[PDB]
Amino acid sequence: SNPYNKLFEERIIFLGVQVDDASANDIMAQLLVLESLDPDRDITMYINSPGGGFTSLMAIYDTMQYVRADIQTVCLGQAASAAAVLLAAGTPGKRMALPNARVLIHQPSLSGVIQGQFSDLEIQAAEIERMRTLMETTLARHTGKDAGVIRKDTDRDKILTAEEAKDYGIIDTVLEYRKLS
Amino acid sequence: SNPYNKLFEERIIFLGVQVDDASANDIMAQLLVLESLDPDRDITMYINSPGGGFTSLMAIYDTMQYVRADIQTVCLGQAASAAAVLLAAGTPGKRMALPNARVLIHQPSLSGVIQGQFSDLEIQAAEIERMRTLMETTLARHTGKDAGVIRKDTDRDKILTAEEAKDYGIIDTVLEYRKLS
Amino acid sequence: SNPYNKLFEERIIFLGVQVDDASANDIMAQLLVLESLDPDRDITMYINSPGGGFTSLMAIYDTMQYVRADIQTVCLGQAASAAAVLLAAGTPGKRMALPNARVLIHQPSLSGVIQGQFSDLEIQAAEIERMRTLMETTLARHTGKDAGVIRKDTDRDKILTAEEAKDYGIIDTVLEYRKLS
Amino acid sequence: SNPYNKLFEERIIFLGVQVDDASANDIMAQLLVLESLDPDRDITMYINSPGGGFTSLMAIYDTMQYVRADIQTVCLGQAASAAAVLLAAGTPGKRMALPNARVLIHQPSLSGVIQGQFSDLEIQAAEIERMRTLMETTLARHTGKDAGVIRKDTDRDKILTAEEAKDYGIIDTVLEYRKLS
Amino acid sequence: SNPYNKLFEERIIFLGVQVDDASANDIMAQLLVLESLDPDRDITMYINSPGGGFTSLMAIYDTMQYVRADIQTVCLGQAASAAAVLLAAGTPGKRMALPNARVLIHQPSLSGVIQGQFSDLEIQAAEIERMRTLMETTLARHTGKDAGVIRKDTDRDKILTAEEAKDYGIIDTVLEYRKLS
Amino acid sequence: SLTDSVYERLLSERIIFLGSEVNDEIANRLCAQILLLAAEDASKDISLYINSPGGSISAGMAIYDTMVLAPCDIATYAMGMAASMGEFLLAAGTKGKRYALPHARILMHQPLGGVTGSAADIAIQAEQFAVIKKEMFRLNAEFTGQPIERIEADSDRDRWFTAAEALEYGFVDHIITR
Amino acid sequence: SLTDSVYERLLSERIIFLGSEVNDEIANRLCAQILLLAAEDASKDISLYINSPGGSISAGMAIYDTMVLAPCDIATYAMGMAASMGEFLLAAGTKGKRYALPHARILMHQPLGGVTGSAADIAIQAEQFAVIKKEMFRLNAEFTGQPIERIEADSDRDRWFTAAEALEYGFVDHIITR
Amino acid sequence: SLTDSVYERLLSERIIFLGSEVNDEIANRLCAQILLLAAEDASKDISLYINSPGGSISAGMAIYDTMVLAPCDIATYAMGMAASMGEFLLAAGTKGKRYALPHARILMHQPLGGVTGSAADIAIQAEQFAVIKKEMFRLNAEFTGQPIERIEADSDRDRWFTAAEALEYGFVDHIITR
Amino acid sequence: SLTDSVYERLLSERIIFLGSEVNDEIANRLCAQILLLAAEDASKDISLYINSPGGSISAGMAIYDTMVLAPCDIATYAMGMAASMGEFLLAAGTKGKRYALPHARILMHQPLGGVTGSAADIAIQAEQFAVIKKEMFRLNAEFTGQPIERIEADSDRDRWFTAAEALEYGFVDHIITR
Numbered sequence A, B, C, D, E: 001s002n003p004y005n006k007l008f009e010e011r012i013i014f015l016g017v018q019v020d021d022a023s024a025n026d027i028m029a030q031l032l033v034l035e036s037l038d039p040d041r042d043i044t045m046y047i048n049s050p051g052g053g054f055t056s057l058m059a060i061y062d063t064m065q066y067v068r069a070d071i072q073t074v075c076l077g078q079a080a081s082a083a084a085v086l087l088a089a090g091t092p093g094k095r096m097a098l099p100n101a102r103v104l105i106h107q108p109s110l111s112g113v114i115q116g117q118f119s120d121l122e123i124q125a126a127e128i129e130r131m132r133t134l135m136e137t138t139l140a141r142h143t144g145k146d147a148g149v150i151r152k153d154t155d156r157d158k159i160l161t162a163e164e165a166k167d168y169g170i171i172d173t174v175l176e177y178r179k180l181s
Numbered sequence F, G, H, I: 001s002l003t004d005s006v007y008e009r010l011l012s013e014r015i016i017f018l019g020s021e022v023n024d025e026i027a028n029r030l031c032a033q034i035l036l037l038a039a040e041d042a043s044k045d046i047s048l049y050i051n052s053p054g055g056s057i058s059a060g061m062a063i064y065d066t067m068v069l070a071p072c073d074i075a076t077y078a079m080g081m082a083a084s085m086g087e088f089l090l091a092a093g094t095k096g097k098r099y100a101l102p103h104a105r106i107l108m109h110q111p112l113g114g115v116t117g118s119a120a121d122i123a124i125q126a127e128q129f130a131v132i133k134k135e136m137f138r139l140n141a142e143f144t145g146q147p148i149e150r151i152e153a154d155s156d157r158d159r160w161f162t163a164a165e166a167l168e169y170g171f172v173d174h175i176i177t178r
Ligand SMILES: CC(C)C[C@H](NC(=O)[C@H](Cc1ccccc1)NC(=O)c1cnccn1)B(O)O
Pocket: A051, A052, A053, A054, A055, A057, A080, A081, A082, A083, A085, A106, A107, A108, A109, A110, A111, A127, A128, A131, A135
């Protein structure tokens, strides 16, 4: 067994890589297996991800909201873009983050230019607008902010230190070091 | 065993990747094995796919319509192009989707330019037209729309939220979260 | 078993490669497994890394500070950039280095240009400034320097020989050769 | 088992590939395992390497000087640059080389141009100078030369035949053929 | 077991690929294992190689001259450049070649241009000259030619048919077909 | 050159060519030529000939502004192809002076573009794409005389015209037959 | 240049060359030259020489429109190769003035193109490909005098002609023999 | 060339074009032209026409400095596009002489750049990015007459203007209507 | 060209531009122009205008040597950007004749380079990098009048100046305000 197989025996999934469809289908497959192995024991989800992806975000957003088990998110070094939404998507009272982890909340973007007629670009922009409102509505029900506050805050990159990510509501506890180590 | 091997023991196949011939032959091989293991138990088909491919679509469209088992489709984060047709291709009463999954119905396209004489391009266009009518005839027998309504709706990209994909007829239930999580 | 599997049985992890997210998630998975196998036995961490990465640094900085086991860092040939911070991040009294290992402490940089509007670049620069202060605050609590001394010292590349890395406070012992060999 | 697994059972490690960090961490993992299996039995180290790398050199220089076992180096066809330092780094009385093996001692170089301000290039050049003096101080304590003689000799490429590499002090015995073969 | 594992049980190594350091370290590892398994039983060495490499040549030249076992070389389809030297490097009375195998003896070359100052190029040329004399001195002690004859013969490519490679002294017997087949 | 010397001799006869994709280089070359010909004779017609696969909106709006603000009557000529910004500048000629050569084909389609960047950037681009597409359709409705609801319906996708179809639609006023 | 100075001296003798693939650059250069030569002498023949591997339909329709609407009689000359749009502009010359040099080879084939985009875009392109191919075949039937059903049958794939085969087919009116 | 000969003839009529991205090559070409035209007649207006997608700040500050220090009144003309450094040099014209052609579109946005290198290098770049952005916003507040707090609020992201919106905002003083 | 003809007409008025990165091509072009203008009139000022992102040290030392050894007084002008070798040649002008246009920005930084090759080659390069950096800082201390210990402290990393900051630092002697 790997370490990654050993953490999964203790119901811990790594996000680790960026949230694309390949990573989202991995995490959804891991969240549903861990739901079936013990639905009343908390899945822990370690997040060191640079973000990326919205449908892949909302694939593993909805799955960690679907499953019978409570999700404990732990931000390791980084939760940027989509991964900060997944960090807030843990169960309240859960959602740890290590003390030097940065949390980068950020409005949705298009990676590169997508061409098309203006009637096709009015739809790709009505979609990136409803991707923006869905990013802010999701992040408001998990941080307790007012979803126009998040639109003002995620208007640019807002890098949150873990101590000011629990003041923002992204996490709940900046988890302390166990032994001085 | 992987998680993907564990979901397949519980008769769940991921679409996950885009629908190309490599992915279609995988899903057809998975649908026929799960038909042979228990033909009277519902195959579940998880769809997080960006679509793509029409013959690969109609390869795994016809197979999930062929098999003795009812197919339960679940849109995870995305069902675009072909995937949305496969999402509607589940059994009626089945066809779930997670609440923040987008469903992108979309008329068939050519990825890039295919050259040729005009008598060869009248045939590649009579094919992309009958690929369009077959996309609309398939999506009309599974959504209950009138197949000219779908031609008007899939004339551009029509991104459906899951709540308005069951109003469209693509899915039947936006499936609720089990525990608050 | 590999040699790498054999060193991990004796609770030794290699840093080895540069600190990116792929390497950080490996080391965090290894540090948490070795914490769970025996939390009161010292994890040794071998560092031959050229550095790189700050969120991946602070991912495995925080984990080696989190775990119940004391971390013994050993610089093999090189601890450059982020890896010198991980070298100082071992437990005091631990933190060895081989006699011809160089330790390259170094202020954070951007690999290549990141474009954007000036209001977006005021934030990427307020981040690389707080990445700089966090690099210096971390390296001051582990070397006992005054964090403005480290700003003066890491203003350029400061390559430390192991004998002058214990005078700097990065390591504690330049560990002697066992047999003449 | 491979042949490489079979030679390692008889406490023989191949250098073989060039000395980069991937190869250095392999050899350090092999030297420490063979130290732990039997610390009083001589590790043999076969060197057919084109050299390269200084921190990776001094990673496996220091390890073969660290371990309790005496190291027997054998130059197979080539010990260039860094690998010639590792060839001299064997135990005195050991350090064989095959009769048609060339030994290429060579001053440290930069593979390609590293850019920067002159205050940053005064440090990369003070480092390649102390890499040069450390290459010459290491090669003087193992060949018995006066370290200014080696600066005069490694000023250019000095390709040593094995018969004139024991006159130089790199090796001790040009080892004879066992049977005519 | 592969066929290649089956031939090695009968003490046959393939050269097969070109003689680079990766192939030379394989053959040296195979020659030393077969020496240790039975040092008084003839290792057979099948040569279908396009040559290449001089230090990798003299790595497996010296090893097949080192080992206690006699080496039987068999040229399969080709022994070019370095591999023709290895073909002659078998034990006298051994050194077969199949009847339509070509043997290409050839003076050493530089693959591509190596740049440098003229004082650095006087050394790379004094090396390719002593690589040339070592190629001719080696090929003279195994063919019985006068080493100035080989300089005249390998001045260009000299492709030897197997029937005229035993007249040259490269091989000893053009080995006959066993059954008409 | 040769091709620049023939264009220079037609420029002396007040015949300029839009013969490429309308980018900022060809637009500033035409805007320079319209300003240069309106400075020589302010009362003599300029014969712009359109053989264009389209181009940039703002490049063609630069030409269209110099076509209007010149005191000359810009006679336009669909020569083979008047697509995208080429049909726009074709239909932008003086009324009674917009010509199609009989085998020129006029492509009318809504503007193409590309959305880029963050969702606040794209919401500004799409706000501006709705401004550009409304003004492009307003001017095509002004040029052709078609209703703007018909302009936005026909120019949804590619809407090809022959010289006789563009005559009855309103892009050109005559078809040259000599 | 040299090659531009020789072309300029032939342009003074009213001899223009279609010597490349007919794209919009060469077409606008020829359309400029036909307009320039029809402005010098309106009653003297223009000797276009075709050495062309074909080209764009709309580029060649720009040339064909300027060949017709010029008051000059455009004498055309198949010089080595008159393929695709090159045979079209060869056969587009004035009747009695379409020449083939005796070893020129005339390639007649239906237009090539490419379908791109969504199925509603492609259905418009193929609707327009049927318009272009019908008009290209109508004009080749008008030029050669062949029936349009024979034009569409021969120009299904590549249909090569020698100078003597193109004479009896109808592309050229004479073969130059001096 | 042709396009250089038409620009040279407009340069004789004191009409220069900013028609590209404002880089150091186009800026030094315009600064040369402003110095050359201010040396011919020091009392006659220079008609700069802006068709620009923006450009470098320091390149446009070179033009803006030569526009101010020339004794001529630099009349500016938004011709199709004045985006970024193009709107800056548009609004940098003499008051009463900043014109927009009626379909020109003015893009106002804060400067783009890129941070590079070590954290001590980037802290100097961002210190200088705050200097450049404050001076760019101070001058846009000086040109338009808007408050600098409104300039920094509108020019946070892309802020598009029509010719009539830029007239009431303050970039241009008139709209040419002839 | 056009841009070469405007530069040639300013060269007749003894106005040369350093408008690019100072490489050996632009340096030898300026050194040719300084030698050509010092041969026409040895007593009339040459107005070099700096819009430069920096460049090579030895290329700028070629210009600086021809600026000094010309009998003309090289008036220099920071026009938008006088970075690196551009600020050096700006400050290398005749005292009383070094000007900054009011929005030019002066970047002062130590020379960049690259070490290459063996450790005996690099020890010679760094020996020569210490010679170049000491002589560059000695001349900036001579030009500005600042101490060489302040020059080496400010020019450790990028040290940006406005036109008013470079005036009090010593790069320029005036700021042009007309
Ligand atoms: C903050 C959350 C919402 C995610 C952030 N951005 C997005 O929403 C991502 C960014 C992205 C990633 C890959 C390719 C294109 C765009 N948005 C999307 O995935 C996306 C996909 N289709 C259309 C529009 N946006 B993250 O990637 O910065």
